[PDB]
Amino acid sequence: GSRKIIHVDMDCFFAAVEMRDNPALRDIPIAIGGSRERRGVISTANYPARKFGVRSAMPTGMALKLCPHLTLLPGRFDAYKEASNHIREIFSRYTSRIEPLSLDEAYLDVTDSVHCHGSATLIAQEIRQTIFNELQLTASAGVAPVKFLAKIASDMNKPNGQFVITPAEVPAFLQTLPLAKIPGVGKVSAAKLEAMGLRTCGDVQKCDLVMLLKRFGKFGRILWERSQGIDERDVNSERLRKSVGVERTMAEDIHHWSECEAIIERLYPELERRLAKVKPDLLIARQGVKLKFDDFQQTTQEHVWPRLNKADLIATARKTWDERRGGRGVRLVGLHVTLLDP
DNA sequence: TAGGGTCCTAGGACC
DNA sequence: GTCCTAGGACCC
Ligand SMILES: Cc1cn([C@H]2C[C@H](O)[C@@H](COP(=O)(O)OP(=O)(O)OP(=O)(O)O)O2)c(=O)[nH]c1=O
Ligand code: NA
Numbered sequence: 001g002s003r004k005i006i007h008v009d010m011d012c013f014f015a016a017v018e019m020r021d022n023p024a025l026r027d028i029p030i031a032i033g034g035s036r037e038r039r040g041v042i043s044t045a046n047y048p049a050r051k052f053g054v055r056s057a058m059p060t061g062m063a064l065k066l067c068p069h070l071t072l073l074p075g076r077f078d079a080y081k082e083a084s085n086h087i088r089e090i091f092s093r094y095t096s097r098i099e100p101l102s103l104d105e106a107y108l109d110v111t112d113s114v115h116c117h118g119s120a121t122l123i124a125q126e127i128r129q130t131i132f133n134e135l136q137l138t139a140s141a142g143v144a145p146v147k148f149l150a151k152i153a154s155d156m157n158k159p160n161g162q163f164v165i166t167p168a169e170v171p172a173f174l175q176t177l178p179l180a181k182i183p184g185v186g187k188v189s190a191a192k193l194e195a196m197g198l199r200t201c202g203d204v205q206k207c208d209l210v211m212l213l214k215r216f217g218k219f220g221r222i223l224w225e226r227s228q229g230i231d232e233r234d235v236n237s238e239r240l241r242k243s244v245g246v247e248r249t250m251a252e253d254i255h256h257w258s259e260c261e262a263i264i265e266r267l268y269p270e271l272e273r274r275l276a277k278v279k280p281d282l283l284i285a286r287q288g289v290k291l292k293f294d295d296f297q298q299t300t301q302e303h304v305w306p307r308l309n310k311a312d313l314i315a316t317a318r319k320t321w322d323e324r325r326g327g328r329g330v331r332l333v334g335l336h337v338t339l340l341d342p
Numbered sequence: 343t344a345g346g347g348t349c350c351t352a353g354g355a356c357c
Numbered sequence: 358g359t360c361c362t363a364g365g366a367c368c369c
Contacts, residue, residue, distance in 0.1 A: 013369090034344065041344050043369085056369080059343045077346095102347090102369050184349090186367050218350075219366095242348075249344060286362090296343080300363065334345090 002167055003111045004120035005235065007142045007150040008127060010087070010104035011159035015046040017080055018073055020136045029054065030071045036061045038251050039331070043075060047159070080104075083135055090130050094123055099235045105154075107147055109235035124162050132160075145170070146231035152181055170229045175202040182226045189219070201227035241278065245290075246271040247334025253294055254330050257321050263333045264289075264317055268310045271335045275308055282308040283340065289317040290334030291325065299324050302336060 010016065014032040019025045029049030034040015042063050045054040052067035064070055084103035091098045097109035116122035124141040131139045141162040142153025149170065153163040165173055178200050180190040198204055204212075204227035212220030225231065246267050254260060275282055287309070288302025301320045305312060313335055 039343075043344075057344085062343085104369080184367065188366060239348095245346070247345065288362095298364080302362070304361075332344090 002145050003109060004113070004118075005144055005147055005150040006108040006110055006120060006124045006127070007144075007147070007154040008087070008091070008106050008108065008124070008131075009140050009142070009151075009154040009158070010083075010131075011138045011140060012044055012046055013083075013104035013137075014044045014075060014080060015049075016137050017076070017083055019046060021076075021079065025071065028071060029067050029069060030073060031060075031063060032073050032075045033060050033063070034074075035072060036064060039249055045070075083137060086135055087131055087139070090127060090134065093130075094127065096237065097235045098237050099239065107150065107235045121162075121164050128160070128162065146229065147233050147235070148183055148226055148231045149173070149229065151183060152177070167229075174205070174227060174229060175200070177201045179204065179223070179227075182223070184219075184222065189216075192216075193223075241339065243336065243338050244271070244274050244278070245334055245336045246274065247290055247332055247336075249292075249332045257318065260291075260317060260321055260330065260333055261314060264310075264314055264335065267333065267335050268313065271337065272308055275337055279339065284308055284337050285340045286338035287313060288336045288338075289313055289320055290332065290336060291317070291320055291330055292332035292334075293325065294329040294331060298332075300336070302338070308337065 015030055018030065018032065027048060029046065029052060031042045031045040031049050031054055033042040040060045042054060042056055042058045042060060044056045049067055049070055054063045054067050054070060060072065080103050088098065088100060088106065091106055091108055094115055095108055095110055095113055098106050100106040110120050110123050113123060116126065120143045124143050128139045128141055131137060138160040140154050140158040140160060142150040142156070143162065143164040144150035144153050145167050149165050153165050156163040179185050179193050179198060193199070204223055209221070209224045212224050216223060248263060248267060250263070272282065275284070284305065284307060286302050287305045288300055290298065290300050292298045299320060301316050317333070
């Protein structure tokens, strides 16, 4: 065998950072997200705002109809990154087996740990306490014998808490667990699963793997495994970024190539700057563009290409503009880069 | 009805 | 098989 996996997850991460750096926001409803006038969405919200129904990914117009006094912040990504680096350094104090999934969360493999008398529970507890002491931010944690159960667990005693799932507890936990709580089972999948009478891990246990493989491919094997507590994925501390993208949704749809070209001229220096931080010679594997139309269809056009080049992105966007727009208006323009393999 | 990404699928090209 | 490209589901 049994591993001890901890998933650490910061509470209301972006919003928690803003309230720490401005205590005036502590008890009023706030949210990081673009304005209604920019057609933006909520990145996240504090608990005063969540009380009204405000959620990550909600259109900002909907947020404000639910919570008219919502205070809207633009977001300070360097401040989030600074806090992320700090908590990761704190993780390193306890193990090198750290797989971060995002700025604010990480899997830890504490199986071969010596710290708190081998206790994963006490280790998770003083990570959360150390985070609070050194950053004035709170985290929740989940402790389980595999990654996905640890992740489900870190959500269950949020904010500022934790939850532990022992292998003895695993079967009762699974029996009623809704499928939609498994990472990677989203709305489309959960609706497909519901349309055949499958709601929970107990429901999936009672059905045949061969059928699940037909109907969901490799995904159906994942569902079958997870519904049994089976998650052999190792905590991997060696993953690297593979792409970088820069895209923008305009406050109004554009209808003229000249407007599209202007957008790209402003997007391109931001893409070069971010690429250079990680590859100073701008050498890349592919580059490409993205248009999202008014019928919310999205198209991408990307090709092998050795080195970030503005004119070829303009050229490609022009081809895409002409060949695939079919007269509809355009809400989004994006530039994209696929990085070399090593 | 964002912007930052990952992983998977699938057809044709190419070997 | 494996590369190329396009698109979709999903996560934070
Ligand atoms: C889900 C989500 C998160 N984010 C950002 C803001 C979040 O603070 C950060 C981490 O996401 P989460 O861990 O999903 O959410 P959270 O920290 O805000 O809330 P919770 O306490 O329930 O865990 O990433 C988005 O920008 N868009 C999204 O759709
Ligand atoms: Na979080």
